Design a protein around this ligand. Structure first.
Ligand SMILES: Cc1cc2nc3c(=O)[nH]c(=O)nc-3n(C[C@H](O)[C@H](O)[C@H](O)COP(=O)(O)O)c2cc1C
Ligand SMILES: O=c1cc(-c2ccc(O)c(O)c2)oc2cc(O)cc(O)c12
Length: 288
């Protein structure tokens, strides 16, 4: 089993070390290991080394991703990789694209794109401003429905490379991901149970009558029982969860329906005149 470790920190930084430490644990369980340092890659924002990166990820049976924490979440580059995953890696759209290709004599997309895969994440920050990175990390796995094994946060971690018990945790995360990879079907989540019984998220969007899991999208209710929170939802919601095939097929269907409505609206006079008033009112300022 091939484990790919990816770091988004500085060259030779703490994220490099935690990630290489996971890789060492993985080799201990018998895996072939590879390491990619993202500072060596050129990756543009969603509007270039990205295709290469994805090819590397598609060949791995499991992935360990270690990211610095910036403003409580993953780095902007981690969010760009997430942006760029959609068009390429959505499990829903790739199932559709492959069925369509078969039946219409089209060329069969990358079979790798649909293989099951396990992924673990590590978020390394220097303080306790760490409340959003696990969700950010979960979002990247959500689009292709890779099976999350661990999704770990390390606050106060500037000196983590001399904190033996926390380095030992990353070693164990490496063990887990190699073990999970040996049998991706029977691999099971090893991380924290969290609050969302489906996502394991602890991040929720709250409004009167509706608490929403910020990762899996389940709409339900948060309960405070003496300081312990818990999340409940009605079973019909499972159909709609953003990390299930069912919920993705629905989501994509609404996208197709709303995209057709936009195309049609873009041919109305209402649209064209408002747009022309905007073009006439102002011109975008650019640098010299
Ligand atoms: C602009 C910036 C914002 C940061 N924001 C946070 C933060 O919100 N929470 C946090 O825990 N650490 C934060 N950090 C600390 C970085 O996570 C830390 O420097 C990183 O773990 C270093 O990893 P490396 O050694 O691999 O580069 C921030 C660092 C920078 C430079
Ligand atoms: O190393 C850290 C460095 C910084 C930081 C960010 C922007 C600056 O203009 C600056 O002068 C320092 O912010 C942090 C914020 C954190 O929560 C944890 C950290 O380790 C850091």
């Amino acid at each position: 089993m091939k484990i790919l470790g990816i770091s988004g920190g500085m060259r030779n930084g703490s994220n490099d070390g935690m990630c290489i430490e996971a890789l060492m644990g993985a080799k201990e369980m018998g895996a072939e290991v590879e390491f990619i340092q993202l500072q060596n890659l050129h990756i543009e924002h969603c509007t270039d080394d990205f295709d290469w990166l994805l090819d590397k990820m598609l060949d791995a049976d499991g992935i360990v991703f270690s990211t610095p924490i910036f403003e409580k979440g993953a780095t902007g580059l981690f969010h760009t990789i997430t942006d760029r995953f959609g068009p390429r890696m959505d499990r829903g759209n790739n199932i559709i694209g492959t069925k369509i290709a078969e039946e219409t004599g089209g060329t069969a997309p990358d079979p790798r794109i649909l293989k099951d895969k396990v992924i673990s994440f590590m978020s390394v920050g220097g303080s306790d401003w760490v409340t959003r990175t696990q969700c950010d990390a979960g979002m990247l796995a959500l689009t292709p429905m890779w099976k999350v094994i661990d999704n770990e946060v390390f606050p106060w971690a500037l000196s983590i490379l001399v904190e033996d018990e926390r380095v030992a945790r990353a070693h164990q995360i490496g063990r887990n991901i190699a073990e999970a990879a040996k049998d991706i079907e029977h691999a099971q989540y090893q991380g924290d149970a969290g609050v969302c019984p489906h996502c394991h998220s602890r991040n929720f969007h709250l409004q009167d009558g509706k608490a929403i899991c910020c990762l899996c999208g389940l709409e339900g209710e948060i309960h405070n029982e003496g300081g312990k929170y818990s999340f409940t939802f009605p079973a019909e919601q499972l159909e709609h969860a953003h990390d299930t095939l069912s919920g993705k097929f629905i989501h994509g269907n609404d996208i197709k329906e709303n995209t057709g409505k936009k195309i049609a609206n873009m041919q109305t006079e209402k649209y064209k005149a408002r747009q022309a008033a905007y073009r006439a009112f102002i011109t975008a300022t650019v640098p010299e």
